[PDB]
């Protein structure tokens, strides 16, 4: 009912959601009563085999992930899909005995929706875990910006810069590809804008830090001024990174 929130999810489930709607258009909403559905044992046994596989691949993920939220949230989706499968199977049987069975049609619709819905939940949960990984990179840059305060040597500054360079570059790549995958254009705009702002402030931060280190070890002058520009750049960067974290979590 909502737009699938990534392009991958949309290309997987969008075909299925449409087919389900076409099935409903007939049969249910009071319309094509008394039609006659053929034997569905074949196509249901194939869904059943795909359900098995999905649950296989999923239970390997669960016992293998570090993500504790993932570990908890996947199992319910497995239940929803197996339970929806169980109706599809009862529908195959019911239609074998009566091609005109109306409970068989209701089960078939409910079942199909349950497969869609449970597979949607399984993919969302998985996606959420991928997003938390990007948020891990973001919070580590945030933590590290907190430590710009304690840099006072040129040697400190160059270590700070060596360790910050990879973090920023990994983040930039992650947000770039994430943004591409999104299906809400306004969410891409925010991530690109916030990111572009962080990127452009990075060299300003380093220049601000050079300035503060240099004014400090020339042993006096406008140190209070150099201090509040470095601080502003860190508050402004941390603000954007936080905005990035918030917007990544939208769906």
């Amino acid at each position: 009912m909502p737009v699938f929130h990534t392009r991958t999810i949309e290309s997987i489930l969008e075909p299925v959601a449409q087919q389900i709607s076409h099935l409903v258009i007939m049969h249910e909403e009071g319309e094509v009563d008394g039609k006659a559905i053929p034997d569905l044992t074949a196509p249901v046994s194939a869904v059943q085999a795909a359900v098995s596989n999905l649950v296989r691949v999923g239970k390997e993920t669960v016992q293998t992930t570090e993500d504790q939220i993932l570990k908890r949230d996947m199992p319910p989706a497995f239940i929803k899909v197996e339970n929806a499968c169980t109706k599809l199977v009862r529908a195959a049987q019911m239609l074998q005995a009566d091609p005109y069975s109306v409970p068989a049609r209701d089960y078939l619709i409910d079942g199909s929706r349950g497969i869609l819905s449970g597979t949607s939940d399984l993919l969302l949960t998985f996606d959420e875990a991928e997003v938390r990984k990007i948020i891990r990179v973001c919070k580590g840059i945030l933590e590290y910006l907190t430590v710009a305060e304690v840099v006072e040597t040129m040697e400190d500054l160059v270590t700070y810069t060596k360790n910050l360079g990879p973090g920023m570059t990994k983040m930039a790549k992650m947000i770039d590809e994430r943004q591409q995958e999104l299906t809400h254009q306004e969410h891409r705009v925010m991530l690109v804008n916030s990111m572009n702002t962080v990127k452009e402030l990075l060299p300003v931060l380093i220049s601000a830090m050079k300035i503060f280190v240099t004014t400090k070890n020339t042993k006096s002058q406008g140190i209070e001024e150099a201090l509040k520009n470095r601080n502003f750049t860190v508050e402004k960067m941390s603000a954007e990174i936080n905005e990035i974290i918030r917007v990544l979590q939208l769906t």
Binding site: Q19, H22, L23, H27, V51, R56, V81
Partner: peptide, 21 residues
């Protein structure tokens, strides 16, 4: 789960195609 989910989608769409054949 991407290949697992593609396969369940392909299987379900095909089921749902055979229920209007």
């Amino acid at each position: 789960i991407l290949e697992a989910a593609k396969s369940i989608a392909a299987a379900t769409s095909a089921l749902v195609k055979a229920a209007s054949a």
